[PDB]
Design a protein around this ligand. Structure first.
Ligand SMILES: [Ca+2]
Ligand SMILES: [Ca+2]
Ligand SMILES: [Ca+2]
Ligand SMILES: [Ca+2]
Lengths: 632, 632
């Protein structure tokens, strides 16, 4: 009869043998945390290896990303579709077992980790999703949404700033079904971490012997009854060819690499209990569907990530309405306008801002999570990684707003949205020197380019309300990647368009103003600079010059268009091209090459009123004409 | 006889009148914190308005960046070169009073703030600089370096992750002369902030009435005796045309906008005490210079930011030695090699890593700060903003290392280094898919481009040890901006060069391999991809093709070169150009336009051994030849 320790040692054996064979990786977390995992996964975790997408499974997040063999071991041992051959391919090209866990490519991996601090943030988001979805959907006698979020984290995560942001907020929102296990395994890190977490309003369980199954169980039982999120502080000491063989022998583990005894597999396998757990929940879901069929249909739709059947038609009708009202407003107001039309169609939208609001917004709070808007406070990074967790969890389409400059605080989370191919919607306001007096520390220059070079991210910089509506629609309908929607503080004039041009906004780049025959000059512009481009077009046309304005609200989408469409907008034979954008010039060589010109920014901004800054930096009619004159 | 409150109200009056006239900005911090400032600045602060560069002045940092009128009011009132006319130009183009304080442009502003959390981090760096410089230079009977670092911060700073990183480290290093005043002025922020700071090993003074001068003084006296950094938690409630007039009248402030009574100016003026304070310290410095002239000379040199007279000659000799040893090593090893040669020449270097080390490194600790290397722990953002504070303080040249991917965690601090034009040296390792198995979450793609589009930042990606030595030398000698030095994990072959080519490395971009007459093809490469470019050059030359290799270790420097030098490296008439770099392709349109080609990355990476990833992503001899064939 295998002991708990023998079963935990299977995780230790597989981890160290996998690392050894790959000659790469680190068996830290699995060595230290295996006994904790054996209790947690065998005695508490509700999950079905046959269906890792069961909507009411418990969520487990390994924030110590480097501990990847811990999760691969657990998934293999408990019966997921991850075999011994996968473990022997750890860290090899296109294996199912990459060096850090990657959501999508591996059955049972709930998020992509590696960058420290973000795992715990993702877990915070998942626990938030569960709490909100439960408050939205649960009814008397039908607790259909009801599961825990368990996370493992280490010293690295605790040192990172993002831990402070997301633990603080988790405390304020009372995410009592978030239960985190800190691997306190042991010059630069002396925090009293338990006291710090009490300051956030968490319950803390101190000094848990991480190699004692009775202590671990007692802590977990306490945490599962908590009214607050709980941090279980686990003291561990196990861990680190000769060193491996020594430790392996000390553990009393005699078996050859990758061989696990049949009774150990039997005691780890979760297919039997897992089947029964999901079947029991399916029975409760059917009861819910009978008693509340409208809700239940909405829940399923939302869990699938499907939009309402008529959203596309209503949204295109809305885009057309806007194109007819023809207002001149800040793209920031057009965004709030789009949310006002789209919000009431999309009960799955979960908005917020790093403290955006439309008429039906209702803030979530600890006492009442049935809302649809989160006040994240001054926590840009934490907001972003939380939104990743919300998106992974299912049930919502999250969006989150801050100033474009503070994208930089959240930069790696934005990158992770893209890497994981999640539909997370970033709203970045105050997009340029147009913000005026706040000055160079707040004025973006290089940030648009940073977003545009992020793979799988779409960045929309709408020239007016019509393009703002198209951008939101497109972002919402994009299920397989994130979008960043960039808005001005200042007013943007409505642009005239025919039906076909409004349609072509969705192609990322299109002809807004044209000449009869091949243009002598092409003005490419985005966002708040399209209006200036149109002025230059007006003026230059009066001189008999054959000019075209191309509005480029989304470069990544434009690039995805077919060769013949691209030739129709930016013909390869017209080298006389001028890009106009209040952002870093260097990006635009992609579109004007070495034969064209760029009217952009090549320095930091200044603290002055916007009109004075635009004058100062050359975003004037006169300067554009001069550049054209020089170029032609 | 003006009361304390009347004197504090001068700050309130000027702040609100300045904001009103500009119709922009927020008088929050000055309204709330004016009584605290009146105690702190009149009764405690050691400073000389006639010389804001006095080396032993106390340092004051306003982390609530939006509170800019607080500092402009203090500087004006106490007699700095900032007049009433400057205050009336708050937030106007090229005024001395920009919307957020900017170091360099305004007498007495110690750092540029605005992005929340970074002010306090900068203050942490300044207190670290003082503590290290004192331990390095002070001797029995000559406490020549001896001053406090006072900082104001608010809720926004406290919510930001960076506060956790820098307060944690400040606690560990016992920066007991750092004294911070928290404006606790009052849904999303419920931390028990005092308890959190105790967990970092700070002293906390709770519940200080921020409008009671006796309570404020008592707290400051306690803090000034503390063995730990101290957080003074100040409860404030004062603050927010009609509303302004109401508050102004309530305060009993009858005077017209911008008029301050003569006795209030008299009681605020610090020119008399300031003169005496600096004169007293100058007398002690002379005594130190008599007793320890070598040290004292070194201190002055270092405070001036001057390098040793013979550093340039020794460093060029070193570059030449490396060019002769001709080794093939990871650029990461060449960096450590350069530090081994340069380190012992530069006692001002203050290194570190977000836990790099050369033979004479000695770690700083709480008990012994006489070292030259800081273990920042897993705190990339905090490290970077701290280094800014170290650079501003004087006495050091800081450098700090992390993985290139985690530049993203510290992104805005890097931008702030550049904005402030400070010599801070960023060392970014593991620069590409060449890092291998750790996989896409760690593998940079877009980060080089992000650095390259940062104004006033130089980014060096050295192809071998010779270029690594040139890059370090150039970075060290660059006093008016920061540098980012980018290193590979994998081995880089030595490139053959004549004397003139080694010299031209310092020009940012140069001809490494050439053809007789005008080239038919130009291969532009950087860093670890230059070796592949040379292979392609060898192969293609054998075919009779006229090829050139341009090595481009620093684009920003290359761009600063004269037109005729640029024409000599990248002739405008040779359109057949191929850029080769294991990073995002889109950057390179700047150098190859629409007629050339790019062999780079356009996706995230993968988890595999490096050779397999280079094969997979097309960094092979065969692929390069194919692209040339297609292009020609
Ligand atoms: Ca215990
Ligand atoms: Ca439909
Ligand atoms: Ca009190
Ligand atoms: Ca010399």
């Amino acid at each position: 009869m295998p002991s708990r320790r023998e079963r935990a040692n299977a995780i230790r054996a597989l981890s160290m043998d996998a690392v050894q064979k790959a000659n790469s990786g680190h068996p830290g977390a699995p060595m230290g945390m295996a006994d904790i995992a054996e209790v947690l996964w065998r005695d508490y975790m509700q999950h079905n290896p046959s269906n890792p997408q069961w909507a009411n499974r418990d969520r487990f997040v390994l924030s110590n990303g480097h501990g990847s063999m811990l999760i691969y071991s657990l998934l293999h041992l408990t019966g997921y579709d991850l075999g011994i051959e996968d473990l022997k391919n750890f860290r090899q090209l296109n294996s199912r077992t990459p060096g850090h866990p990657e959501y999508g490519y591996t059955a049972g991996v709930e998020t992509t980790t590696g960058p420290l601090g973000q795992g715990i943030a993702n877990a915070v988001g998942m626990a938030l999703a569960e709490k909100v979805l439960a408050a939205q959907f649960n009814r008397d006698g039908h607790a259909v949404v009801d599961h825990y979020t368990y996370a493992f984290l280490g010293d690295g995560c605790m040192m990172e700033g993002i831990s402070h942001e997301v633990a603080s907020l988790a405390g304020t929102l009372r995410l009592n079904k978030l239960i985190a296990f800190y691997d306190d395994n042991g010059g630069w890190f002396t925090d009293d971490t338990p006291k710090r977490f009490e300051a956030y309003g968490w319950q803390v369980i101190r000094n848990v012997d991480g190699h004692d199954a009775d202590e671990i169980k007692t802590a977990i039982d306490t945490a599962r009854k908590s009214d607050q999120p709980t941090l279980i502080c686990c003291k561990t000491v196990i861990g680190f060819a000769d060193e491996i063989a020594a430790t392996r022998a000390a553990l009393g583990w005699e078996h050859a690499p990758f061989e696990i005894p049949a009774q150990i597999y039997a005691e780890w396998d979760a297919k039997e209990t897992g089947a029964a757990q999901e079947a029991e929940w399916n029975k409760r879901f059917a009861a819910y569907q009978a008693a509340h069929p409208e809700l239940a249909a909405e829940l399923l739709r939302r869990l699938k990530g499907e939009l309402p059947a008529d959203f596309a038609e209503k949204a295109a009708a809305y885009v057309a309405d806007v194109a007819n009202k023809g207002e001149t407003i800040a793209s920031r107001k057009a965004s709030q306008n789009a949310l006002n039309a789209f919000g009431p169609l999309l009960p799955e939208l979960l908005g917020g801002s790093a403290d955006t609001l439309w008429k039906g917004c209702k803030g979530v709070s600890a006492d009442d999570a049935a809302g649809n808007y989160v006040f994240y406070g001054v926590r840009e990074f934490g907001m972003s990684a939380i939104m990743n967790g919300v998106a992974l969890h299912g049930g919502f389409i999250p969006y989150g707003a801050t100033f474009l400059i503070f994208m930089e605080y959240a930069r790696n989370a934005v990158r992770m949205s893209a890497l994981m191919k999640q539909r997370v919607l970033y709203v970045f306001t105050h997009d340029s020197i147009g913000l005026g007096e706040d000055g160079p520390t707040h004025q973006p220059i290089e940030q648009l380019a940073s977003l545009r070079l992020t793979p799988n991210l779409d960045t929309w910089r709408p020239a007016d309300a019509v393009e703002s509506a198209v951008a939101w629609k497109h972002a919402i309908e994009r299920a397989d990647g994130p979008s960043a929607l960039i808005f001005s503080r200042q007013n943007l004039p409505h642009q005239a368009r025919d039906v076909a041009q409004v349609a072509d906004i969705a192609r990322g780049g299109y002809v807004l103003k044209d000449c009869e025959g091949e243009p002598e000059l092409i003005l490419i512009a985005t966002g708040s600079e399209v209006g200036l481009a149109v002025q230059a077009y007006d003026k230059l046309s009066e001189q008999g010059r054959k000019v075209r304005v191309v509005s480029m609200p989304c470069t990544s989408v434009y690039e995805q268009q077919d060769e013949s469409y691209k030739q129709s907008v930016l013909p390869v034979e017209v080298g006389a091209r001028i890009a106009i954008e209040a952002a870093h010039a260097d990006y635009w060589y992609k579109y004007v090459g070495l034969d064209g010109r760029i009217i952009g920014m090549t320095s930091f901004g200044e603290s002055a009123p916007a009109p004075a800054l635009f004058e100062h930096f050359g975003f004037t009619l006169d300067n554009v004409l001069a550049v054209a004159e020089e170029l032609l």
